[PDB]
Structures are given as C-alpha cells and as structure tokens.
Amino acid sequence: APRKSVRWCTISPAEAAKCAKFQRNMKKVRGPSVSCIRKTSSFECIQAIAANKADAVTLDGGLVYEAGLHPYKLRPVAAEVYQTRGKPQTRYYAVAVVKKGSGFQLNQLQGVKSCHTGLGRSAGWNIPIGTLRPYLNWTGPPEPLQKAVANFFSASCVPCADGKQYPNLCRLCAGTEADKCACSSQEPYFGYSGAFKCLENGAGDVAFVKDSTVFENLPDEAERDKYELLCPDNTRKPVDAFKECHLARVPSHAVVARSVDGREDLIWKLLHRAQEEFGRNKSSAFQLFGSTPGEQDLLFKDSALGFVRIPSQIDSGLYLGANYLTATQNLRETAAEVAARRERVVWCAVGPEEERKCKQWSDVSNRKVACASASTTEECIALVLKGEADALNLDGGFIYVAGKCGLVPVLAENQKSQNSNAPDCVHRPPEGYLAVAVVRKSDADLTWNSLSGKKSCHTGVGRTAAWNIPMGLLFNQTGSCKFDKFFSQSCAPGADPQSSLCALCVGNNENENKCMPNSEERYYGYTGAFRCLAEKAGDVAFVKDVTVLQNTDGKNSEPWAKDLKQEDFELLCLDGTRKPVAEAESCHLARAPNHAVVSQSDRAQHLKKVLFLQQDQFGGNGPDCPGKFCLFKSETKNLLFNDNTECLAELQGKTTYEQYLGSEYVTSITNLRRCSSSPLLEACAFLRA
Ligand SMILES: [Sm+3]
Ligand SMILES: [Sm+3]
C-alpha cells in the first residue's frame, strides 16, 4: 500500500534550505512527504534523476530540452503558471533590458557588455544568441558557439560558462573565488534577477530576461522609467510594453521526471497539495513561491501562481512546440543545414507501403522532398507538431484534429471530376465525395433499418466516409455511445484491438498487426474496407460510391476483387431505399469534404510552391508519370493520396479548418466527442490553450 517520497534535486546551498523548510512544513501539514538530494546544477540535477538518484527538478525550457535528449529522457510532468498582467499563462516573453541613454540598438550589440541568467536557458541565451546569430560570424557547429558570443560581447557574466576557455563569458560575474561564474545561486548574477542586477550595478548594458523581472524588483514606477526594451526591429520602448517588445515568447518552466518509472503520481500529488498548503497567500507558515532577498527563484519561479499537470503523451519536443525546437536545434546545426531544412519539405507517411512510396518520390525529386513516417495518422500529426515533419494528407476526420492542433489545410485533392478536365483542377472548386452504404444485393432483406447487431467494415475510425458520418447518424438514432455495441462485430482498425470493432480484421498477410490503422491491415481504408465486405467477412461497408467502381468489373486486378461486379452491389439509402451502385447521387448518407494536405501555417506557402512543382512533374499529366514515377498512382492501394487524384488545389479561401470542413460536420463531430475522446485532441487542448 505505501508509496515513497519525492526526491527533490537542489542546486545550491540556497535551494536546500528552502527545500528543507518545505519538507518539514509538509510533514507538519500531514501531506505526502518530501526529501532533498544535493548537487551543484540544473544540468547535474538532470543526470541524477536520470540515474534514479532522485526524482524531480523544476526546469527551464532550455533545460527541459536537454533533459529530453536521448540518454536521459526526462519529461515535463508539471508546469508553473505566472503573471501575464491579466490572464494567467504557461508562456512568457523573452526580452532585453538596457538603461535609457545607452543608445545601441539590438542590431548593434557588438562591443557591449551583456548579462545572462545562465548557459542554455531561454530568456538569457537560447532566444538571444539565436537572434543575434546573424551578426556572430561563427562557422557554425564545428566551431564552438561559446567562443562566438565570447568574442561578440566585450566580456559578460554567463552562468555555467566555461570561463576557463572563454573567461570573457564570466568576466562580469561578481562571485567570490570559485563562486565566480558558478552555475547556481552562488553566483549573484545567476538567474533573471541575477542578470538584472548585473545590469543595474552598471556591470553590463544589456540584460536578457523574463518579462516581469524588471517589475519584479522595481516596485516603483519611477525607478522603472530609468530602463527600456531593445525591440527586434531596432527601436527602444518602455519596460511595460514587452507585449510588443520582445525577442521571443517561450513556454513555462516545468517539473521534470522519468520517461519510465518517474513516479509522476507522487510528484503531482506533492505539488498539488503544495499549491494548496503554501501557494498564493494560503498560510504564512511557509510560502512556495517565496525566496530570500539573498537569492531569488528557489525551487520554483518566484510569484508563480502554481502548476498545471501536463498530460502524458506530451514528451518534451512537443511541450516546447515547433517554434522553439527549430531555433534551439538551430544553434547546433550549420547555416547550410539550416537554410537546407527551410527550403525542403519532409512528408509524413503512415505505414510501410507508404514510406516506400515516400522514398520513391524522394529519389524522383532529387531530395526536394524527404521523408518521416510512423504507425498512426495521429502520429504523423504530432511529428508536424514537433517539426520532424512538415506535412501530409489528411481526411476531413483528421483535418478536424489537425485543425484542433492549430494546423491549416493548404492544398486540396481534386478528383478527375467531370465537367471539363482541363487545367481546371487547379482552380476547380473541390466538389466533394459521397459516402454510401454498401452491401451484397444478394443480401436484400437488409436495409439501413436493419443494421442492428450485424457485421460492419470501416475504413478507419475517426475517418469521414466510414466512421464519422455513419456512427454520427447512428448516434442520432440510438441515444447511446457504445459504438462497439451496435454492430455484432466489426472491422475498423485503430479501434481497441480487444474489441468487437477490431473483430473481423485480418492483420497483414501473415496475420500480424491486427487492427493497426494503416495499409498493412489488409482491411484498412477505402479498398480494404470494400473487400472486407467482398470477402464477406461482413455485410455493410461504409465507403465512397466511387470505391466499388474502382475494384469491380476487372478494375483492381487483385484475386479477391477480379471477378467482382457492380451489379453485385447495392446502396442503402436513408429512407430504407436500396439502389444499384450508380444511383449514389440520390442514395448516400451525405457529402464528404475532399481530403486536404496540411502543415503549420508558417510554411503554408513554401509547402504549396514545391508541391505545385512536384505536381507539375508527376501527377495527372505528369510529363513523367507513366514514366519514372506517378505521384497520384498506387496499385489500388491509395499511397499518399487517393488513386483517382487529378491534382491538388486552392482551397477557394477556405483557409481555416472550420471553413474547409464547414460548421455542420464540425458540429456533427464535436457532438460525437461527447461519446469519445482521443489522446492528441486532448494534448493539443492543453498546448493551444
Ligand atoms: Sm527562463
Ligand atoms: Sm477517406
């Protein structure tokens, strides 16, 4: 029954004392217990926990990142919350404080003495040095960045700096013999405050800090008018306009632990009660977010409202978020590397057959596109979220989540629709596709009204054509959320494998991977679903009219198909009517949005431009399609895009997810969520807040 005490990793004599007072205040409270291990730095604290020598340490963004790097695998368990001047947050602005009349503009920093909180943290280093990178003249990765900055500022006070090799980086540090440049509250200038003083005492001319710092020691407006903000555009404004003025915005500091056996469950209890037993003015016997006049920021960041518990799928990268990981990694990749990465495009494949495919496209384009894959649509969405990946094709069903995660649909898949297949596609308004209800005419007693407890084949859950529309419908008639209970059994990969919904699925040829949601599941997607009913594994196939068409009457030359015939298939129609496969126009459940590639709005454009190129060299009329590669072709296997894709088009202004899918569906979908919820939709829920 008992569960251990949280080992908290301190960093200087200061921290312990504080940690101390906490542990005891804690027990005096009859709350989960604590303890303090003792090392010398945040970087150290990391390793310690790594080797289960301890369990937690509140970390800076910059440090979180390192903490997540391979060997250690640390996770932002909890997040602090601060000022904002109004509505509380987990994001903070990174600035530059200089004394009125110092003159120099941010682009002029060469020659100035500068202050820094410590090595590698956001506000003081990560953000700043990257900004000024364009004036460093530093070979890149091969040549130590320390020497750069070293030689960029006349001298300075860099905590954790390797002042032996680059003494200039700790010159300014006012610290005793070895306390000098120490990487803890033993160095007076270490930390936000730290830096501010380093500027206040005239040591430096520019401090890189937290947006609240200044107000965090200048209680009197007057004093506050003595200083300013170096805005990235080259002007200077007042300390309280960080809002416009700032080098960057960066995510909150966080309580980190182990990828595995972190004891998350003990940590969060500790902090939760802590907010509650000694946070914002609750008692007077102790104060979490209160530190000595000697040193600030002990254990947590001073005057932090409190914490928020991060959801678990969140692993650092993500926590950070794109914008930050790129630049952070940017300070350790060559310019070349850099510009390289900016000009290309990494596509995110789901499943092997696809990666293969992405591999082709790669070699065919001469690397203008490269590849990033994984086992689940979710998965490739995250990757874009993290920045290992730029983009991929989504179906409206994933559009919705992607959109929830802040991504935007760039180009649309436009079928060789029918009117006039001239370069109309490009401008042609995406006209949609019909999700139909399919079964064996053979089996006619059957209707839409009959599907209670029968066999169903779904292309994928969380997808439109199949899942979304029908279940949504069924949701409208059953008044109940037990999706697995409706059809006797089912085939719908990405469902819980030990459920009926993944009952009728066949895993790859060697029957492995039952229910995964990708092409190995021979019953996955459009085709796979049509066959699941074809091989009669089930009775009702939720798919697109077109679907049937593509594999019957000798279309797909695959055995299971081969002798399939249009006439053999009937459409269930919303009024109990059944029709042949052609009357779809009047025999469908509804109209689905065409699929849509997507990425971070950021690259929105460049994404568009090279794909447009790629599509002029390899899609519908690809001068080289039947020749050395066809982007839009994949052996009735739908690799990357639908096999009938004429091309990809302009969204006719639909630029926000809602716009593209439209209110209704969107609403249709948000209704279902009342039934269920996914991991990533949740994740984002907290990140985008
Ligand atoms: Sm910081
Ligand atoms: Sm689809």
Is-contact 544 435, C-beta < 8 A? yes
Contact 479, 470 (CB under 8 A): no
- The C-alpha atoms of residue 636 and residue 539 are separated, in whole angstroms, by 22
- The CA distance from 164 to 180, in Å, is 11
Q: Which parts of 294-351 fold into alpha helices (H)?
A: 316-320, 322-330, 335-343
Judged on CB neighbours under 10 Å (0-12, 13-18, 19+), 548 is: buried
Structure tokens at 548: 């049937």
Residues 461 and 467 sit within 8 Å (Cβ to Cβ): yes
Q: What technique was this entry resolved by?
A: X-ray
Any idea what DSSP says for residue 133? G
3 in a labelled binding site: no
Place of tokens 């459409």: 571
Query: How far does the centroid of ligand 2 lie from the alpha carbon of residue 607, in Å?
Result: 22
Cβ neighbours around 281 below 10 Å, total:
7
Could you tell me the domains of the chain?
1-91+251-339 (3.40.190.10), 92-250 (3.40.190.10), 340-432+593-689 (3.40.190.10), 433-592 (3.40.190.10)
Q: How far is CA 606 from the centre of its chain?
A: 20
Q: Which of 5, 35, 73, 454 is catalytic?
A: 73
Q: Which residue, 298, 245, 307, 312, is CA-closest to 272?
A: 307
Documented resolution in Å = 3.4
Judged by its nearest atom, the ligand closest to the C-alpha of residue 297 is: 1
Q: Per residue, what are the HEC states of 218-245?
A: CCCHHHHCCEEEEECCCEEEECCCCCCC
Counting ligands in written order, the one closest to the CA of 117 is 1
Ligand approaching nearest to the C-alpha of 304: 1
> Partners of 233 in the beta sheet?
none
Structure tokens at 283: 């008692």
Q: How far is CA 472 from the centre of its chain?
A: 28
User: Tokens 């436009």 appear where?
Assistant: 414
658: left (phi over 0), alpha (psi -120 to 50) or beta: alpha
**Distance from C-alpha of 298 to C-alpha of 306, rounded to nearest angstrom:** 14
Q: CA 393 → CA 100, 293, 390, 639, distances in Å?
A: 52, 55, 11, 10
Rounded to 10 degrees, the C-alpha dihedral 365/366/372/377 comes to 0
Strands 156-157 and 114-115: parallel
Q: Which two tokens stand for residue 39?
A: 């090392």
Other C-beta atoms lying within 10 Å of the C-beta of residue 140: 17
Q: For residue 621, what is the enclosing H or E element?
A: none
Q: How far is CA 442 from the centre of its chain?
A: 48
3-state secondary structure of 59: strand
Name residues whose C-beta falls within 8 Å of residue 216's C-beta, 6 or more positions apart in sequence.
Answer: 192, 193, 196, 210, 296, 302, 303
Whether the Cβ atoms of residue 409 and residue 393 lie closer than 8 Å to each other: no
Backbone angles phi, psi at 558, to 5 degrees: -75, 120
Residue 456 tokens, joined: 């169903």
- Helix axes of 42-50 and 61-68: crossing angle, nearest 10 degrees: 30
Residues 6+ apart with CB under 8 A from 494: 376, 377, 460, 461, 462, 515, 516, 517
Give residue 643's Cα distance to chain centre: 29
Inter-residue contact 439 to 540 (CB < 8 Å): yes
CA 490 to ligand 2 centroid distance, Å: 18
CA 93 to ligand 2 center in whole angstroms: 41
What does the DSSP 8-state code read for residue 311? P
Rounded CA separation 97/647 (Å): 52
Q: Dihedral sign, CA of 105, 109, 112, 116? A: positive
Strand 345-350 to strand 114-115: parallel, antiparallel, or no bridges (unpaired)?
unpaired
The backbone region for 160, taken as left when phi is positive above 0, alpha when psi lies in -120 to 50, beta otherwise, is left
Cα(201) to ligand 2 centroid in Å equals: 64
Angstrom distances, CA of residue 172 to CA of 21, 189, 210, 458, 599: 33, 9, 20, 66, 44
The full DSSP string for 530-589 is HHHHHTTS-SEEEEEHHHHHHHSTTSS--HHHHT--GGGEEEEETTTEEEESGGGGTS-S
Q: In a 3-state reduction of DSSP, which class is residue 377?
A: helix
* Nearest of 120, 142, 122 to residue 335 by alpha carbon: 142
Q: How far apart are the C-alpha atoms of 140 and 124, rounded to whole Å?
A: 20
82 is in an annotated binding site: no
Taking the centre of ligand 2 as the mean of its atom positions, its distance from the CA of residue 395, in whole angstroms, is 5
Pair of tokens at residue 572: 């269930």
Question: Which secondary structure element, helix H or strand E, spans residue 28, and what is its range?
Answer: helix 13-29
Q: Is 70 within any annotated ligand binding site?
A: no
Q: How many whole angstroms separate alpha carbon 210 and alpha carbon 195?
A: 10
Say if residue 102 is exposed, middle or buried (CB neighbours under 10 Å; 0-12, 13-18, 19+): middle
**Helix, strand or coil for residue 363?**
helix
Confirm or deny that 328 is annotated as ligand binding: no
Q: 291 by DSSP, 3-state: which? A: coil
Name residues whose C-beta falls within 8 Å of residue 283's C-beta, 6 or more positions apart in sequence: 277
Distance CA 77, CA 272 (A): 12
Active site residue 628: no
Active-site option among 259, 480, 676, 677 = 259
Q: Where are the alpha helices (DSSP H) in 120-185?
A: 127-131, 145-152, 168-171
∠357-363-367 over CA atoms, to 5°? 110
Q: Does the active-site annotation cover 73?
A: yes
**CA angle in degrees (0–180, nearest 5) for 661-662-667:** 105
Task: Tell me which residue of 398, 340, 405 sits closest to 370, measured CA to CA.
Answer: 340
Q: Which ligand is nearest to the CA of 413?
A: 2
How are beta strands 345-350 and 369-374 bridged, if at all? Answer: parallel
